[PDB]
């Protein structure tokens, strides 16, 4: 999160930013309600009448330069990620090194870290697969992505 007060301050004023007031049921996680309708409560259904006890879906904001910092706009970005499902290309900054074989050495493969000897593996892997495991569900084999 980070304020952009200057960008949200206009002489005419800004009101294209809207938040919902009313909804019949709670919105699900990681879902967006694209439906445009006025929330209806119990009896006296509005059918677009939007008088008393029936409310339009949209509600605007009050961002103004004069308006106080406390309620001033904040720009919010949410970063969400899931790891260890597929080979990952969202990898970071690091470089790499030549593979070492038949010698006890520490190794990391595409964000997977294991403490054991690395040797050429007899086991033949089908195109889709990227990992191998034993009876105890522990890492047994890996494929260097570059190699």
């Amino acid at each position: 999160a980070w304020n952009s007060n200057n960008l949200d301050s206009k002489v005419g004023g800004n009101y294209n930013y809207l938040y919902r007031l009313f909804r019949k049921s709670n919105l699900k996680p990681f879902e967006r309600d694209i439906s445009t309708e006025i929330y209806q409560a119990g009896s006296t259904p509005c059918n677009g009448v939007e008088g008393f006890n029936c409310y339009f879906p949209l509600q605007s904001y009050g961002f103004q330069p004069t308006n106080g910092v406390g309620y001033q706009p904040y720009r919010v970005v949410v970063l969400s990620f899931e790891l260890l499902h597929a080979p990952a290309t969202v990898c970071g900054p690091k470089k790499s090194t030549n593979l070492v074989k038949n010698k006890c050495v520490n190794f990391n493969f595409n964000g997977l870290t294991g403490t054991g000897v690395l040797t050429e593996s007899n086991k033949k892997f089908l195109p889709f697969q990227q990992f191998g495991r034993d009876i105890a569900d522990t890492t047994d084999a890996v494929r260097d992505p570059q190699t």
């Binding site: 980070w2 809207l18 919902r20 900054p93």
Partner: protein, 49 residues
């Protein structure tokens, strides 16, 4: 292109939030963590450093 997402002319409102999927590329988070121009950088399950 994390930078492009961070700086945009228009940010979607809460009713119809804008979502972008970033993959197949290399992102450095140091600038985001490093820049420290943002009021709040709360992190869950991941160490920012």
């Amino acid at each position: 292109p994390f930078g492009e997402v961070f700086n945009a002319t228009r940010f979607a409102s809460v009713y119809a939030w804008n979502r972008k999927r970033i993959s197949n590329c290399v992102a450095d988070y140091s600038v985001l963590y490093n820049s420290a121009s943002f009021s709040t950088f709360k992190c869950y399950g991941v160490s920012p450093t």
